[PDB]
């Protein structure tokens, strides 16, 4: 096509700078390009990232990156609906364990990146009662399969 | 005599190969239908059977049985790759219905016994009449079947 582009492009450099690859390396990540690519995707992701981690290699990295206010809530836990709602309001990050396949209908509105803005505040409808949504909320879905 | 003669002597009627049923009809069940068909055919033509002579009555009662018998095992016949092939096989074996015969180039179903005529006159269908019914499912065309 002949579109203006640099002579030597690699996806790793665009997604993330060299310095932040050196940060990740310290937070229990290997130096192989495949894992850096993967780590670079989740940073630039416009959607919620569903991660597949046999040997929990991804999960260890996620725990390293999110040093502060990281909460891991499995699907099996009975107060997971109540915990997520309280997390959405004021949570740095959220991690969901298990959720191998057949994702619960309560998460389907959350999974949707479209949010409803009521004046100044932003409102996201999960379960019976709508919960107040805050910016810089992150959601990570890990599945061992 | 007719009941006894058509079930015991004919191996072809009870033969799985010759007659292909949709559902596995029991012997007793097919007899119950013959009886209920024969019933209604006697009530309609009771006054005609008394007016007629015993010789043409003896033909007429056999005919009534064949027609009733045909239909009592006719309905159950179907399934397979082609329904037409299973009918033609059943048409062939039943075509030998003792003294009474069916006209050639017609199915046993298509012919019904007329008491006044005695000619096994084929089923007459009423030429469809156009109707102003908006729904297509409401519009009913008559067929030989």
């Amino acid at each position: 096509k002949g579109i203006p582009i640099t002579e030597g492009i690699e996806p790793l450099k665009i997604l993330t700078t060299e310095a932040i690859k050196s940060k990740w390396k310290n937070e229990g990540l290997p130096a192989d390009p495949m894992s850096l690519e993967n780590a670079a995707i989740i940073t630039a992701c416009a959607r919620w990232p569903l991660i597949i981690d046999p040997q929990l290699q991804g999960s260890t990295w996620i725990r390293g990156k999110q040093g502060e206010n990281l909460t891991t809530i499995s699907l099996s836990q009975p107060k997971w609906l109540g915990a997520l709602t309280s997390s959405i309001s004021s949570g740095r990050a959220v991690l969901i364990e298990g959720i191998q396949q057949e994702i619960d209908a309560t998460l389907d509105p959350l999974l949707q990146r479209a949010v409803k803005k009521n004046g100044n505040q932003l409102q996201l409808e999960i379960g019976g009662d709508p919960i107040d949504y805050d910016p810089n909320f992150k959601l990570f879905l890990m599945t061992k399969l | 005599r007719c009941f006894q003669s058509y079930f015991e002597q004919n191996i072809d009627v009870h033969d799985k190969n010759r007659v292909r049923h949709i559902c596995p009809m029991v012997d007793i069940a097919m007899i119950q239908t013959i009886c209920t068909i024969l019933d209604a055919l006697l009530i309609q033509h009771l006054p005609k059977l008394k007016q007629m002579k015993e010789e043409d009555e003896k033909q007429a009662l056999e005919a009534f049985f064949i027609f009733a018998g045909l239909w009592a095992i006719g309905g159950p016949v179907g399934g397979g790759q082609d329904d037409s092939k299973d009918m033609k096989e059943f048409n062939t074996v039943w075509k030998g219905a003792a003294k009474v015969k069916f006209p050639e180039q017609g199915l046993c179903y298509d012919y019904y016994y007329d008491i006044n005529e005695n000619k096994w006159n084929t089923w007459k269908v009423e030429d469809y009449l156009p109707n102003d019914q908006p729904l297509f499912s409401k519009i009913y065309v008559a067929t030989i079947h």
């Binding site: 002949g2 579109i3 | 297509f136």
Partner: protein
């Protein structure tokens, strides 16, 4: 201008899909079924297709906590608007997300199969609907105060003025289990399958979103739009290899 604003590409293949949905709605009594993968635009193509024709679309709203009796009351409200003689034919919109459980489908199939679900309203309420249709029957010149052909005529009108639109995804054997379980759905409704968007259509999608963005010679735009189609196609070929 009037309804909620919906953006769409309006490519050749999408437009063809609008045409053959408009066609199924134009046929009286016949119901439309749309089958396609998640995001095929079918729900938004239906709402548009409905509006193109002179029909009023009513979709049920499902809350997190919903009950069979709550559904019946939403349907019941729709049938009051159809019952009146001088009424525009109501379209009914359903998606896989709207069907939270399989119990909610049972009423809808008995509606869509023929007439209206058995014992939706009381007998005394039905009698008051029948009387309103009697005024129309006089104008039509159909037999009145027969209480057999009139009741029948009411079922014909209700059938003509109710259209049922279903939307499923053929991704699991769950939809196939719906077909097996629910006989009315597959035979009564007119199936419509959405194929993936052609390479030529994908070019037009990109060409629409790149508009109102600055470029050096706007030849980049026309080329990028090709590459956007080529990249999505090359994933499906790689996905087949995978």
């Amino acid at each position: 201008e009037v309804k909620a604003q919906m953006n769409l590409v309006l490519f050749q293949q999408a437009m063809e899909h609008v045409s053959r949905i408009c066609r199924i709605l134009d046929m009286p009594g016949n119901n439309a079924l749309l089958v396609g993968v998640g995001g095929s635009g079918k729900q938004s193509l239906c709402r548009l297709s409905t509006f193109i024709n002179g029909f009023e679309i009513d979709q049920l709203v499902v809350t997190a906590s919903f009950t069979i009796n709550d559904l019946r009351n939403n349907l019941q409200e729709i049938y009051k608007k159809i019952a009146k003689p001088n009424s525009i034919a109501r379209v009914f919109m359903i998606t896989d997300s709207q069907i939270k459980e399989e119990q909610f489908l049972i009423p809808i199939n008995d509606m869509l199969n023929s007439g209206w679900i058995f014992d939706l309203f009381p007998k005394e309420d039905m009698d008051s609907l029948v009387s309103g249709v009697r005024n129309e029957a006089k104008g039509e010149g159909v037999d009145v105060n027969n209480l057999t052909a009139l009741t029948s005529y009411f079922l014909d009108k209700i059938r003509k003025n109710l259209k049922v639109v279903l939307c499923f995804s053929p991704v699991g054997d769950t939809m196939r289990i719906r077909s097996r379980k629910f006989p009315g759905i597959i035979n009564n409704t007119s199936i419509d399958w959405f194929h993936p968007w052609p390479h030529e259509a994908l070019i037009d999608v990109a060409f629409r979103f790149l508009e109102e963005i600055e470029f050096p010679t706007e030849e980049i735009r026309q080329s990028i739009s090709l590459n956007m189609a080529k990249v999505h196609s090359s994933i499906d070929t790689a996905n087949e290899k995978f």
